[PDB]
Design an enzyme around this catalytic site. Structure first.
Site, mmCIF file in Angstrom:
data_model
loop_
_atom_site.group_PDB
_atom_site.id
_atom_site.type_symbol
_atom_site.label_atom_id
_atom_site.label_comp_id
_atom_site.label_asym_id
_atom_site.label_seq_id
_atom_site.Cartn_x
_atom_site.Cartn_y
_atom_site.Cartn_z
ATOM 1 C CB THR A 46 -0.944 0.069 1.217
ATOM 2 O OG1 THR A 46 -0.186 0.060 2.445
ATOM 3 C CG2 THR A 46 -1.853 -1.152 1.255
ATOM 4 C CG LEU A 47 2.198 2.811 2.792
ATOM 5 C CD1 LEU A 47 2.659 2.674 4.270
ATOM 6 C CD2 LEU A 47 1.722 4.209 2.458
ATOM 7 C CB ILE A 61 9.491 -0.551 -2.001
ATOM 8 C CG1 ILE A 61 10.752 0.358 -1.939
ATOM 9 C CG2 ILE A 61 9.730 -1.851 -2.735
ATOM 10 C CD1 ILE A 61 11.797 -0.164 -0.986
ATOM 11 C CE1 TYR A 117 14.520 -3.720 7.986
ATOM 12 C CE2 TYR A 117 16.729 -3.651 7.107
ATOM 13 C CZ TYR A 117 15.380 -3.494 6.941
ATOM 14 O OH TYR A 117 14.913 -3.087 5.708
ATOM 15 C CE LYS A 171 14.756 -6.626 5.701
ATOM 16 N NZ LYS A 171 13.427 -6.875 5.138
ATOM 17 N N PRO A 205 7.663 8.805 1.292
ATOM 18 C CG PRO A 205 5.442 9.149 0.681
ATOM 19 C CD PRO A 205 6.633 8.238 0.396
ATOM 20 C CG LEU A 206 6.744 5.797 5.889
ATOM 21 C CD1 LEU A 206 6.735 4.314 6.247
ATOM 22 C CD2 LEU A 206 5.969 6.575 6.983
HETATM 23 N N1 LIG Z 1 12.958 3.018 2.354
HETATM 24 C C1 LIG Z 1 14.197 2.462 2.340
HETATM 25 O O1 LIG Z 1 15.188 3.204 2.323
HETATM 26 C C2 LIG Z 1 14.461 0.939 2.357
HETATM 27 C C3 LIG Z 1 13.455 -0.089 2.408
HETATM 28 N N2 LIG Z 1 13.816 -1.404 2.431
HETATM 29 C C4 LIG Z 1 12.890 -2.615 2.495
HETATM 30 O O2 LIG Z 1 12.040 -2.802 1.342
HETATM 31 C C5 LIG Z 1 10.709 -3.256 1.653
HETATM 32 C C6 LIG Z 1 9.584 -2.284 1.274
HETATM 33 O O3 LIG Z 1 9.551 -0.951 1.835
HETATM 34 P P1 LIG Z 1 8.327 0.024 1.630
HETATM 35 O O4 LIG Z 1 6.974 -0.693 1.038
HETATM 36 O O5 LIG Z 1 8.829 1.292 0.983
HETATM 37 O O6 LIG Z 1 8.027 0.412 3.080
HETATM 38 P P2 LIG Z 1 7.498 1.698 3.745
HETATM 39 O O7 LIG Z 1 8.498 2.002 4.861
HETATM 40 O O8 LIG Z 1 7.275 2.917 2.812
HETATM 41 O O9 LIG Z 1 6.226 1.176 4.406
HETATM 42 C C7 LIG Z 1 6.299 -0.092 5.084
HETATM 43 C C8 LIG Z 1 5.650 -1.195 4.233
HETATM 44 O O10 LIG Z 1 5.519 -2.496 4.857
HETATM 45 C C9 LIG Z 1 4.153 -2.838 5.118
HETATM 46 N N3 LIG Z 1 4.121 -3.528 6.467
HETATM 47 C C10 LIG Z 1 4.807 -3.283 7.630
HETATM 48 N N4 LIG Z 1 4.487 -4.241 8.587
HETATM 49 C C11 LIG Z 1 3.613 -5.123 8.029
HETATM 50 C C12 LIG Z 1 2.880 -6.374 8.390
HETATM 51 N N5 LIG Z 1 3.013 -6.907 9.668
HETATM 52 N N6 LIG Z 1 2.064 -6.975 7.474
HETATM 53 C C13 LIG Z 1 1.878 -6.500 6.221
HETATM 54 N N7 LIG Z 1 2.517 -5.352 5.822
HETATM 55 C C14 LIG Z 1 3.375 -4.657 6.635
HETATM 56 C C15 LIG Z 1 3.269 -1.595 4.697
HETATM 57 O O11 LIG Z 1 2.141 -1.750 3.764
HETATM 58 C C16 LIG Z 1 4.245 -0.720 3.922
HETATM 59 O O12 LIG Z 1 4.090 -0.838 2.524
HETATM 60 C C17 LIG Z 1 10.730 -3.599 3.147
HETATM 61 O O13 LIG Z 1 10.832 -5.031 3.321
HETATM 62 C C18 LIG Z 1 11.911 -2.764 3.716
HETATM 63 O O14 LIG Z 1 12.401 -3.359 4.951
HETATM 64 C C19 LIG Z 1 15.145 -1.705 2.407
HETATM 65 C C20 LIG Z 1 16.173 -0.759 2.364
HETATM 66 C C21 LIG Z 1 15.826 0.566 2.340
HETATM 67 C C1 LIG Z 2 17.384 -0.071 6.219
HETATM 68 C C2 LIG Z 2 16.259 0.943 6.122
HETATM 69 O O1 LIG Z 2 15.017 0.288 5.782
HETATM 70 C C3 LIG Z 2 16.077 1.702 7.393
HETATM 71 C C4 LIG Z 2 15.684 1.042 8.555
HETATM 72 C C5 LIG Z 2 15.497 1.775 9.739
HETATM 73 C C6 LIG Z 2 15.698 3.154 9.777
HETATM 74 C C7 LIG Z 2 16.087 3.822 8.619
HETATM 75 C C8 LIG Z 2 16.270 3.097 7.436
#
Ligand SMILES: NC(=O)C1=CN([C@@H]2O[C@H](COP(=O)(O)OP(=O)(O)OC[C@H]3O[C@@H](n4cnc5c(N)ncnc54)[C@H](O)[C@@H]3O)[C@@H](O)[C@H]2O)C=CC1
Ligand SMILES: C[C@@H](O)c1ccccc1
Ligand SMILES: NC(=O)C1=CN([C@@H]2O[C@H](COP(=O)(O)OP(=O)(O)OC[C@H]3O[C@@H](n4cnc5c(N)ncnc54)[C@H](O)[C@@H]3O)[C@@H](O)[C@H]2O)C=CC1
Ligand SMILES: NC(=O)C1=CN([C@@H]2O[C@H](COP(=O)(O)OP(=O)(O)OC[C@H]3O[C@@H](n4cnc5c(N)ncnc54)[C@H](O)[C@@H]3O)[C@@H](O)[C@H]2O)C=CC1
Ligand SMILES: NC(=O)C1=CN([C@@H]2O[C@H](COP(=O)(O)OP(=O)(O)OC[C@H]3O[C@@H](n4cnc5c(N)ncnc54)[C@H](O)[C@@H]3O)[C@@H](O)[C@H]2O)C=CC1
Ligand SMILES: C[C@@H](O)c1ccccc1
Ligand SMILES: C[C@@H](O)c1ccccc1
Ligand SMILES: C[C@@H](O)c1ccccc1
Ligand SMILES: [Mg+2]
Ligand SMILES: [Mg+2]
Lengths: 251, 251, 251, 251
Positions: free
Chosen positions: D15-16, D18, D155, D159, D193-194
């Site tokens: 929903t958000l 990636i 984390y 991973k 946005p986060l």
């Molecule tokens: N924003 C960044 O810089 C980085 C993100 N990532 C990883 O990539 C993936 C995707 O990130 P985004 O969708 O942008 O995340 P986001 O931080 O923008 O939002 C979190 C996402 O995870 C979901 N979520 C969290 N807990 C949940 C649960 N218990 N059940 C179902 N959904 C849940 C939400 O729908 C949301 O889309 C994650 O696995 C994250 O750990 C990895 C490196 C960097």
């Molecule tokens: C690895 C990346 O998803 C992140 C995790 C916690 C705080 C900032 C950034």
């Protein structure tokens, strides 16, 4: 004490820094050692600083010199008996990006860091196999065999080559029951007189964004992993990379 | 001799196989050692087989038991003084693909192999930091932290977790100048009485398509890399993986 | 369709197998393409088999020929406008262990697989940087940049070199805001007419101990990852390895 | 266009950020998509923002909820027909060192990031195998599956677990001819946005010592590698890691 009893080692670039410390600890642990350098003036003094001629000698040799490799193995066998252990430590660096590397620089660096390690590894397998020596080839690499440095293009090429070439050799030796292991050692930043002569270098290397420990290592840090690898303690280790880097590659 | 002078080590799952050999060589090199196992019946006998109570003792503990970890550190400090060295060696295996892993199997394996290593690592950093001990946490892993095994799904998860979790801990300790290093050891196949009891297992492990050396290792192969890591000889090594696998991961 | 709109690509060794499939899919996605080979007889026919001269042309060039690289870039820019994309695909193999590699074999293989990739990468950065092209250098490697093959010693050296050399180049381009990315592609076994001509080869490659899928890949498997890398879809990918190997390196 | 024709995908945390971008590009390329989130309020709006109910729907589900996984697969099959593609994207972070991680934090993070990915992978293999779907499981990871972050201990554990667990699953699927591939995707820093709501975060991530490109990525950077992996274009890719990180792990 005694961890390298009976071993006979060649250490290329063994007159300074890391190679000198490997030589020192090798002698301490009972190995006989032949150190090399392209130049003669430092060699005999370096050897005498570690031990007596019955423990350690010098042989002038440029590791890029293919025919000189057979002379080196012959001289070592003459002094100490059959060679069991080879540390391919001789190397140079060019401080250029890939983009800015001249072809002459490329060819010069590859001659020492890649061809030289190939020549030593090939000859060492030939001369060390099937003799019950517990033979060990330790190919010196660096963090630059795992990660890039924008200013070390040819050096990165050489270190990545030695990393994977060494695995090929390891496998063939293991599959042929040659009694020869081949592994790589990957120092991060190490303090030596040469680093000390480069203003700002150690400080730059010691920033936490580079080395998480906040300081660079010392030559004995690389000596001790080499003792382990040269010894029968590591008889099941082959085809692997041993990293001693203060955390550099962990982040 | 003397390579672990003054060190005080905890080795989980130290009554058998790899953990017993680590204990044995640790005692030989001057360390005091507390070994653990979930069961009591083997422990005292295992300890007495290595040395006297002033050298090595047993403490019954399931590494999945969080509160038991503080009791274990307290008992060790009572016996030998402050703990310098932790080898998180206790582990189990489930012989199931990911597809066929039950949730109970998943949770049981992660409790020992992942939670237990987390509990030990967290507590060891807390108890070992800032004491000038030359502290070292050695998190046992395996080739299964680098490569998959179709029949070891949860085990692979646990070993990949410990591999990278250990790098996090390494970095934080290095950046905080805690005087605590954290590294992983990655055995390939090792002969133990347990393997000997599994018909066909060693032979299958010794096929060249699995272990290029054509034979599996012995417990001392893992003991010796642990001595190096526990000692001050490895004071610049942190956040790294040390592989002793007969070539398994080189192909 | 349209995924490489406006791109102008050079693909070395583009007349056969993997390089031909990359050329084919590149043209399909809107790129203009110059393919090369050391020999002329296949080239024009290969080009015409993919498309018309306004889509794809041939330039005879041995990738080991340093001065010929500037002629190649000039001819491509003359035909199609400024080059945006370079696929260093030309390579050869020697079927020898390190131990059994002759120096002539070593030098010949490194000239094509290492020097040639260096020459192309260096020139491509120079010619492609700072032009807003979304430039991409794709250095072909193989599983042999990650793991050893006892019978591919020099080949392993070359592939490990290109793997890490490419990271150096990636970093320097990224840090200098050159608008040039550099990545490596690592095919496992791929079926081509050349493999088909080697009795027993595909079957040996398809054993589960080699390729877990139980069959080798096809040229388009490598073409499609190259399209992704050449396109702006991968604008945040640099300094990385892209593996398409049927599971070979996962075990 | 058409690159995912006929595919039916589940994307957890869709929903958000990636996950939303993956959903968007999946729909653009012809896939039907079910997105999830633990909360309901964003879901329907997120879905409607991408497409109509015949293209994309929402299912409320916490990926840590084992029994909810079967409900999710059932709802998707009801809406769109048999599921071909699973993107395990849902995850959380705890900003703590290993040393400072509470057990509750540990268990909460592992429930989502590790157990949840295990539950999805296990069920997806069961439900997707042997159906001629060209099935693909894409387990979202991050640079934190390769390198440590001192402030991301749990984390990192999660991973690293998913990285190697995914290889196990890949191998078993390949060896059983299940027609299911399993691969991991490893984003570096991505602007959402986060991140925008965390003062200083993007700037810190964009320092050259962190991301060599000097800026963070965008959600579509991860969407496009996922399209490649979900498509039949990647039919020979399994058991591998696909890194899109701006150079973070290349240094
Ligand atoms: N924003 C960044 O810089 C980085 C993100 N990532 C990883 O990539 C993936 C995707 O990130 P985004 O969708 O942008 O995340 P986001 O931080 O923008 O939002 C979190 C996402 O995870 C979901 N979520 C969290 N807990 C949940 C649960 N218990 N059940 C179902 N959904 C849940 C939400 O729908 C949301 O889309 C994650 O696995 C994250 O750990 C990895 C490196 C960097
Ligand atoms: C690895 C990346 O998803 C992140 C995790 C916690 C705080 C900032 C950034
Ligand atoms: N000082 C540092 O921070 C780091 C060093 N290294 C590597 O570790 C190895 C050892 O370094 P040190 O001995 O401290 O080097 P050093 O920089 O103190 O001196 C260079 C060494 O190489 C030898 N040498 C150079 N060209 C040669 C040739 N053609 N033939 C024979 N010998 C030659 C010299 O005897 C000398 O011992 C090298 O392979 C080097 O590339 C890797 C990472 C960091
Ligand atoms: N034998 C082999 O081929 C290989 C072993 N390993 C790994 O190396 C390590 C050591 O193996 P060994 O000591 O030879 O094992 P072993 O198989 O001979 O015996 C199991 C060991 O773990 C302990 N143990 C199991 N569950 C425990 C718990 N909940 N709490 C405390 N202790 C527990 C026992 O004392 C025992 O020493 C393990 O982490 C194992 O997973 C890795 C690859 C291969
Ligand atoms: N077929 C297979 O199983 C595998 C192939 N590879 C690698 O992938 C790449 C591409 O292979 P293919 O095009 O299928 O090769 P191919 O074996 O079908 O034909 C060799 C290719 O390289 C070119 N070539 C050779 N020497 C050259 C030179 N000096 N200058 C210019 N071109 C030259 C030819 O045009 C030809 O396309 C190579 O770098 C190869 O080493 C890697 C793993 C497996
Ligand atoms: C990698 C290390 O040996 C180095 C090379 C060139 C200049 C400084 C340091
Ligand atoms: C990886 C090794 O410890 C093993 C695990 C389960 C069964 C046999 C061997
Ligand atoms: C690695 C692959 O390109 C290969 C090389 C030589 C002979 C057969 C196959
Ligand atoms: Mg393998
Ligand atoms: Mg790094």
């Amino acid at each position: 004490s005694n961890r390298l009893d009976g071993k006979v080692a060649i250490i290329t670039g063994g007159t300074l820094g890391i190679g000198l410390a490997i030589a020192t600890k090798f002698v301490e642990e009972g190995a006989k050692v032949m150190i090399t350098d392209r130049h003669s003036d430092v060699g005999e003094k370096a050897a005498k600083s570690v031990g007596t001629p019955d423990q350690i000698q010098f042989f002038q040799h440029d590791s890029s010199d293919e025919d000189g490799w057979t002379k080196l193995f012959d001289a070592t066998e003459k002094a100490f008996g059959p060679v069991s252990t080879l540390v391919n430590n001789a190397g140079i660096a060019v401080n250029k990006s890939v983009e800015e590397t001249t072809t002459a620089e490329w060819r010069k660096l590859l001659a020492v860091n890649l061809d030289g390690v190939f020549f030593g590894t090939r000859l060492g397998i030939q001369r060390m196999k099937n003799k019950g020596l517990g033979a060990s080839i330790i190919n010196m690499s660096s963090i630059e065999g795992f990660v890039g440095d924008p200013s070390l293009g040819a050096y990165n090429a050489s270190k990545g080559a030695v990393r994977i070439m060494s695995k090929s050799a390891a496998l063939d030796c293991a599959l042929k029951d040659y009694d020869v292991r081949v592994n790589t050692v990957h120092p991060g930043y190490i303090k030596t007189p040469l680093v000390d002569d480069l203003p700002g270098a150690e400080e730059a290397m010691s920033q936490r964004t580079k080395t998480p420990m906040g300081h660079i290592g010392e030559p004995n840090d690389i000596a001790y992993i080499c003792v382990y690898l040269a010894s029968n303690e590591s008889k099941f280790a082959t085809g692997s990379e041993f990293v001693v880097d203060g955390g550099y590659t962990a982040q």
